[PDB]
Amino acid sequence: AQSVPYGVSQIKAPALHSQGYTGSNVKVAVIDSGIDSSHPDLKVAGGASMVPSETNPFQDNNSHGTHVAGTVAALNNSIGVLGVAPSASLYAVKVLGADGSGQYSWIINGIEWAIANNMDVINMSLGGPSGSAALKAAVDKAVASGVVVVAAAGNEGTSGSSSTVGYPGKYPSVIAVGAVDSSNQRASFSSVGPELDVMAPGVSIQSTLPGNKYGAYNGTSMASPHVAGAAALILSKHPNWTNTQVRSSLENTTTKLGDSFYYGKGLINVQAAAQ
């Protein structure tokens, strides 16, 4: 039996599916710890590993990349969960190792692979508190090349009036995604600041895990792929829209939630965004 995680419904993805738009032929790179391609609820289209000692991107020794991938594109079938964009072409771009961490140069290599391979969407459920000029250059290059680039805002909560949005989310070229729960309330951990762009469900998100398993986790890591999946739904309906158009469409049709410091533009609504 298949279940639809609340977050998928909350962003109105099933409205798109019912119209016949499920992300077909849109290339989404999950730049993360790999994806367990043996999961029966996932189809991985391709990928590459940038992690020197973990060279198979189709093995996920951590679990995080597999969960993130299932939110983007868990298959529409009779098992497990349903992804936001269940027909999307999912690419395992492994830049984190088994312990869930990576070097900046591995991330940058993953971003460069996604650009060279003409990905339509990049999801980065990762980050760090300081950027680097090289990391900024790579995401800016991706956007200039036409890639919709989405990233977790961070889980650093509040710090007086200071931004706690981490990198690469904090870069203007990158859509920084914060986390809400099923009542659209901000998760206490969700990073804040003027760089917060939109929110998506990021609390008790049920998705795929290695070993043909499922479980529910919290984080802006879980929020980000709802938006990467939404980008894919939009592009499956409107294959000629630019990354600029997909981005404004998502930002302009949100359900407004509150103060932009804490909630950005509010909750994405992919039904409204796709028209």
Binding site: D32, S33, N62, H64, H67, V95, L96, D99, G100, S101, G102, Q103, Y104, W106, I107, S125, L126, G127, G128, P129, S130, S132, A152, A153, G154, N155, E156, G157, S159, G166, A187, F189, Y217, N218, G219, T220, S221, M222, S224
Partner: protein
């Protein structure tokens, strides 16, 4: 309880002593300052980010 501003500049063993007193189930992970990490929020985890001298460089928090 979720963050430890008083541990900035402390050693790793120092940081672990205060964390484990406040939060005995903590799963403590030590990483260099300039590392990329996942954005899952894991209630039992405390990441410790360290400078060149192996001291706490960022306010430790749960997640």
């Amino acid at each position: 309880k979720t963050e430890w501003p008083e541990l900035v500049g402390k050693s790793v063993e120092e940081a672990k002593k205060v964390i484990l007193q406040d939060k005995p189930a903590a799963q403590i992970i030590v990483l260099p300052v300039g590392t990329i990490v996942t954005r899952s929020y894991r209630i039992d985890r405390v990441r410790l980010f360290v400078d060149r001298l192996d001291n706490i460089a960022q306010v430790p928090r749960v997640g």
